[PDB]
From a paper:
The protein-RNA complexes that ultimately yielded the best diffracting crystals had terminal 5′U-3′A and 5′C-3′G for Cy3 and Cy5, respectively. In general, the electron density for Cy3 was weaker than that observed for the Cy5 fluorophore, and average B-factors were higher. No electron density was observable for Cy3 at the RNA-RNA interface, but we did see clear density at the RNA-protein interface. This was weaker than that for the RNA helix, consistent with our previously deduced lateral mobility of terminally attached fluorophores. An omit map of the fluorophore shows that the two indole rings are clearly defined, including the polymethylene chain extending from the distal indole nitrogen atom. If the σ level is lowered then the C3 linker connecting the proximal indole ring to the 5′ phosphate of the RNA becomes clearly visible, but no density for the C3 polymethine section linking the two indole rings can be observed. The distal indole ring is stacked on the purine ring of the terminal adenine (A58), with an excellent overlap between the six-membered rings at a mean distance of 3.4 Å. By contrast, the five-membered ring of the proximal indole lies above the ribose of U26, with the six-membered ring directed out into the solvent, and the C3 polymethine section lies above its pyrimidine nucleobase. The centers of the regions of density corresponding to the two indole ring systems shows that the long axis of the Cy3 is close to parallel with that of the terminal U-A basepair. In addition, the density for the polymethylene chain unambiguously demonstrates that the indole nitrogen atoms of the fluorophore are located on the major groove side of the terminal U-A basepair.
In this study, we have taken an x-ray crystallographic approach to study the conformation of Cy3 and Cy5 fluorophores attached to the 5′-termini of dsRNA molecules. After considering a number of possible candidates, we opted to study a complex of a 34 nt stem-loop derived from 5S rRNA with the L5 protein of Thermus thermophilus that was previously solved by Perederina et al.. The protein principally interacts with the terminal loop of the RNA, whereas the free end of the RNA is flush-ended (i.e., perfectly base-paired), and projects away from the protein. The asymmetric unit in both crystal structures contain two complete complexes of an RNA stem-loop bound to the L5 protein.
Numbering used by the authors: 4 to 43, 52 to 73, 85 to 112, 119 to 138, 154 to 181
Write the structure that this text describes.
RNA sequence: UGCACCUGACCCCAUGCCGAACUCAGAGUGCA
């Protein structure tokens, strides 16, 4: 299955426990979902986004159609993130957390807005989660 | 302007109960 997911359970979760003193494993910050929005024919862009995420994009409308959105959870989230980190990005802004433990990245390369939503309640906990998963910050 | 977060339900719409979800709305946080 997914190496990044295995890295979470084997490496990241125990380090977070040591670092923050969570007394049960279900308290430890987890990835919840990754939402990708691509602003805007539409059929080609939807097919490319479908190919890269493995999931059917919804059409965001003002329609008039204005963008494409996909909410990735579970294995599709992990598989997409493994690609983003290992293939696409080859540092991220460490200040781009939303104040509630979620990370925001806007790309105008290879605009695409990515929200990494976590169960961390603080930016600090979320930053540690993502850094330990291998997100390149600084 | 958009997505995410946040907070709600006059309004289109919604729950085979629940504005949880879906829909919609809004001076604030993040990014583009
Ligand atoms: C270019 C874009 C998406 C952007 C655009 C604002 C666009 C408009 N705005 C501003 C907000 C209006 O509703 C207006 C206003 C009246 C008529 C037309 C417009 C348009 C041109 C659609 N904005 C908002 C500008 C910051 O306030 C950003 C910000 C960062 C990166 C990229 C952007
Ligand atoms: Mg959070
Ligand atoms: Mg009402
Ligand atoms: Mg809500
Ligand atoms: Mg439903
Ligand atoms: Mg809205």
């Amino acid at each position: 299955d997914v190496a990044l997911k295995r890295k979470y359970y084997e490496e990241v979760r125990p380090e977070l426990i040591r670092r923050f003193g969570y007394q049960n494993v279900w308290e430890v910050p987890r990835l919840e979902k990754v939402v990708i929005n691509q602003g805007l024919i539409l059929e080609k862009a939807a097919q490319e986004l479908a190919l890269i995420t493995g999931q059917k994009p919804a059409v965001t409308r003002a329609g008039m159609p204005i963008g494409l959105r996909v909410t990735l959870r579970r294995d599709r989230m992990w598989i997409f993130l493994e690609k983003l980190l290992n293939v696409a990005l080859p540092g991220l802004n460490p200040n781009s957390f939303d104040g509630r433990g979620n990370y925001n990245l806007g790309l105008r390369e290879q605009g695409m807005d990515i929200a990494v939503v976590t169960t961390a309640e603080t930016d600090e906990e979320a930053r540690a989660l993502l850094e330990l998963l291998g997100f390149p910050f600084r």
